[PDB]
Amino acid sequence: SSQIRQNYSTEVEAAVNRLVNLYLRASYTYLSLGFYFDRDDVALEGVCHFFRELAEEKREGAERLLKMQNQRGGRALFQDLQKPSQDEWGTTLDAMKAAIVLEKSLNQALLDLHALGSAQADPHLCDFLESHFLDEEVKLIKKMGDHLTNIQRLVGSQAGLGEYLFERLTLKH
Amino acid sequence: SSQIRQNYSTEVEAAVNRLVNLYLRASYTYLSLGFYFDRDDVALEGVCHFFRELAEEKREGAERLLKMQNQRGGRALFQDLQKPSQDEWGTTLDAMKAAIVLEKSLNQALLDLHALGSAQADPHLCDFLESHFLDEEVKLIKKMGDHLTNIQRLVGSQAGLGEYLFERLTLKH
Amino acid sequence: SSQIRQNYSTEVEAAVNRLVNLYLRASYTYLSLGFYFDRDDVALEGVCHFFRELAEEKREGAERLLKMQNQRGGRALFQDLQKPSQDEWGTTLDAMKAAIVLEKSLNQALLDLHALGSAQADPHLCDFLESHFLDEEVKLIKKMGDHLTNIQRLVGSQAGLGEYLFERLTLKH
Amino acid sequence: SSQIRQNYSTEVEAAVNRLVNLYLRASYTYLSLGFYFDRDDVALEGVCHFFRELAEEKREGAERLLKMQNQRGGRALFQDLQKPSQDEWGTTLDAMKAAIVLEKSLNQALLDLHALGSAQADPHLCDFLESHFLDEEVKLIKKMGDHLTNIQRLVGSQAGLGEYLFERLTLKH
Ligand SMILES: [Cl-]
Ligand SMILES: [Cl-]
Ligand SMILES: [Cl-]
Ligand SMILES: [Cl-]
């Protein structure tokens, strides 16, 4: 067991493990979104790339939490990873709306854990979330909301044209 | 007081201070326009960048006038800076129309001060405006009018599509 | 409106807009201080440079707050900018005393907003101020207090000599 | 005679020749000021350098006027060059006051010639003065007034100390 653990509550330990699960779930969702937009009958490469990048980012967030768990002397515990919510993700607009829902859920879990850390007087935990998670999440959600706005403006009366143009002229390919 | 002042009227001194106010006002207007187009529910980065650049340019014009005021032995006097005329700026077309109105007002103030300088036989003042302001202003207004024309051509029956395409393919991002 | 806003109170939004006004006011004060020390009958270049640098720094602080406002889904709202408190700023000592007063006011506004953010359980806001404002402000006030001390030591019975030497040997020109 | 002369009045031609004389006179004054501050019993190298630089600048101004005279098809006519007004120039403060008097006289001659050119509808002459003389003169007078202010601040009750320090810490050596 730990010879190092200090000021690290069972409650925070458990909430960290749960958050790891949420980040790995989110990573899996993004993997599925990326491969959906890689389908020959969907074929939006910049959309595929956007979500594949996010799958990696979420995996990396989970890994940072697990590294932290160990640094503090807690025990990483893994649970089953549920599959994503959909098998087919509709339009780029549908997908970006689902992604923002997902991110708002992750953000609320970060805030909840921050609040628990504050209540437990665990400033290392609070600082960790502030330094590596909270602003990264705010920036991502801003980016998604910007994307959503542009996608919505492009629907007009020519949805296919708008969806092509967004992928070509906003997203990286 | 000044040991240096020569051929520098009170009328020109006061008109310079007023012009400084007009340029700082214009800078503030452009700051507001830039942050409006940075909103997640507006999200037109190239439009944001265009107006932020102008906020800087107008600040720089004010600073050059203040430097000149001191070179001539006049006294810089600052007044309250009124807030911009709008809190929300509508479409790119709305914004570019407002910007041209603003620039025509600044240009007329430059012309008025030039005429005062001519009447006061102040060739340094007249040369200063000719060398650093008048052509810069004519060039900017030409650019804005070119932009306006392109924006107008793109309204068609698909305003959102046209507004996206202008931002993507004309403005720098 | 925002599709992104989360955990961002109306109270914090409004306090951010007010703080923007305070930073732009401070920027305007520094602009006036800089041009005062550029007067031919004042002529203290290093003092001019010090305050001009600060005018830029304060503008940049306002811009960071406005960027943050948008990242969080709040709405930037601009108000009139009052003119600086003085038209002529006296000695270098007078000016540095006024600058420290100004900075202590800005610092107290940062602390007040931090406290509001804490009360509203808004850790992103709190982290933002900690990461980009609070230490920058403490460092600036330390620098000003160091300057004040040196200026005061140099008054002696030869104020002009001391004011020249401080500008030449402490301040950057 | 000229095959080229066009829109170049006798009045402007003569005023140009007179202005050449004034610039060469000023150059001679600066030569004398420079060698005065090079005296072993004066020995202020940075003051010497400042005035020697100006002797060159004024010579160059005369040369530009003479080049212009020829470009326009006028005839350069040289007159006797009176010696400078003093054989010994007193303190640095005395000298800088005399230099500002001299420069204000040159500046008024530039303005007078500009006005003559305007009256004669000679825009090349007017542009020539605006482009190469008027702002150069305003900038020099500003510099001198800045110097004067610093010199005056340093008199205090220790004139020698102040005169040494100005030469060492403001002027280039
Ligand atoms: Cl199981
Ligand atoms: Cl007022
Ligand atoms: Cl108002
Ligand atoms: Cl003779």
From Swiss-Prot, chains A, B, C, D:
Which GO biological process entries does UniProt record here? intracellular iron ion homeostasis; iron ion transport
Task: Give GO terms: molecular function aspect only.
Answer: ferric iron binding; ferrous iron binding; iron ion binding
Q: Which GO terms of the cellular component aspect does the record hold?
A: autolysosome; autophagosome; cytoplasm; cytoplasmic vesicle; ferritin complex
Keyword ATP-binding in annotation: no
- Swiss-Prot/TrEMBL keywords: Acetylation, Cytoplasm, Cytoplasmic vesicle, Iron, Iron storage, Lysosome, Metal-binding
Q: Which residues participate in Fe cation binding?
A: 53, 56-57, 60, 63
PROSITE patterns per UniProt:
FERRITIN_1, FERRITIN_2, FERRITIN_LIKE
Domain (Ferritin-like diiron) spans: 6-155
PTM N-acetylserine: list the residues: 1
Task: Report which superkingdom the organism of origin falls in.
Answer: Eukaryota
The principal location of this protein is cytoplasm
- Region of interest called Catalytic site for iron oxidation, as start-end residue ranges on this chain: 53-60
Q: Where in the cell is it found?
A: Cytoplasmic vesicle, Autophagosome; Cytoplasm; Autolysosome
InterPro entries of this UniProt entry?
A: Ferritin, Ferritin-like, Ferritin-like_diiron, Ferritin-like_SF, Ferritin_CS, Ferritin_DPS_dom
Q: How does it assemble?
A: Oligomer of 24 subunits. There are two types of subunits: L (light) chain and H (heavy) chain. The major chain can be light or heavy, depending on the species and tissue type. The functional molecule forms a roughly spherical shell with a diameter of 12 nm and contains a central cavity into which the insoluble mineral iron core is deposited. Interacts with NCOA4.
User: Any extra detail in the entry?
Assistant: In horse spleen the light chain is the major chain.
The similarity comment for this entry is: Belongs to the ferritin family.
Q: Which PANTHER family match?
A: FERRITIN, FERRITIN LIGHT CHAIN
**Physiological role:** Stores iron in a soluble, non-toxic, readily available form. Important for iron homeostasis. Iron is taken up in the ferrous form and deposited as ferric hydroxides after oxidation. Also plays a role in delivery of iron to cells. Mediates iron uptake in capsule cells of the developing kidney. Delivery to lysosomes by the cargo receptor NCOA4 for autophagic degradation and release or iron.
Question: What name goes with this protein?
Answer: Ferritin light chain
Q: Which organism is it from?
A: Equus caballus (Horse)
